[PDB]
Design a protein around this ligand. Sequence first.
Ligand SMILES: Nc1ncnc2c1ncn2[C@@H]1O[C@H](COP(=O)(O)OP(=O)(O)O)[C@@H](O)[C@H]1O
Ligand SMILES: [Mn+2]
Ligand SMILES: [Mn+2]
Length: 338
Amino acid sequence: KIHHHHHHMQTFLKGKRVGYWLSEKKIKKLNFQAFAELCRKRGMEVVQLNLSRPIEEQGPLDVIIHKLTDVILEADQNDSQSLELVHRFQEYIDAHPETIVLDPLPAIRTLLDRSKSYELIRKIEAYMEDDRICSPPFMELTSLCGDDTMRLLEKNGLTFPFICKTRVAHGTNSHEMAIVFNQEGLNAQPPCVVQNFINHNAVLYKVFVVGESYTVVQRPSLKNFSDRESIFFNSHNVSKPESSSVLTELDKIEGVFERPSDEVIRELSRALRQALGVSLFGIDIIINNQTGQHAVIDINAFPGYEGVSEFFTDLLNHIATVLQGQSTAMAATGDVAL
Ligand SMILES: Nc1ncnc2c1ncn2[C@@H]1O[C@H](COP(=O)(O)OP(=O)(O)O)[C@@H](O)[C@H]1O
Ligand SMILES: [Mn+2]
Ligand SMILES: [Mn+2]
């Protein structure tokens, strides 16, 4: 009843070379050393890349796995060292189209921007036209509230309550959010993205995607919800494995309370991977308690995968798959085929 296997494509891993770039912090959290040992047993060479040195000397490389998200963000903020690292990486990539990059920098750049990510999700959803999926209205706000704010929100389908998030999707302060409940609450900061709050019975379904495989991990999440003051919170107090606070304590189950559909997750995963070219990412899905629809409220490059015990195996399987796809010239053409 598992019909997809990898034994045959794994045979081709012997002799392949995988470079990786990950922060020391992420290497520790993932225990990336254990993955590197797994690859050797299949006859792969794994090597940590040093982006301060020419990359040519470090190759040849068949695959590069990275999480350069934060370096890219710092390069965006004109950090000279980070700019140098990114340029050196890009130079290499450009010179070596045979090197498979997990994942392409254009996708990483999209995932660093909530406004861009949400618009991509919205368009993908409009293209799929599946009634089991809803795209919460959202918009980017680039000025402090004023006299026209209410009309602007209304015109774009924003309703109270809505959540305010930073436009930059990663790094310092990127997880500081606010829930705005009324007009008085509008003093809650550009550039931010506002997005309609969806009651979802305080259960978050983190879909952790590793190319062709995913694992759904339930997490705590904001409770259902008014002249009340806006709420300011930091999202790592909310939806981490051990998160526990009044913000996540559901008063009672209300409306539709169902687990996500694997059919739906599969179509979302395929569409996002095919459109963006990502493979190592997470989709945060909540179930709208008024419609039972799936709402994708966050998409993250190369997340923590806490609670995904099969990560290294899945990752090795994905590496085998991309090498197989490359070997047989399995290039996508045209638009995303639904
Ligand atoms: N539109 C929304 N409606 C209801 N809850 C939301 C919404 N967006 C985010 N959340 C809640 O806030 C948490 C953090 O939001 P998310 O967009 O995942 O930010 P982050 O990038 O910081 O993880 C989510 O895990 C979920 O609990
Ligand atoms: Mn999230
Ligand atoms: Mn996120």
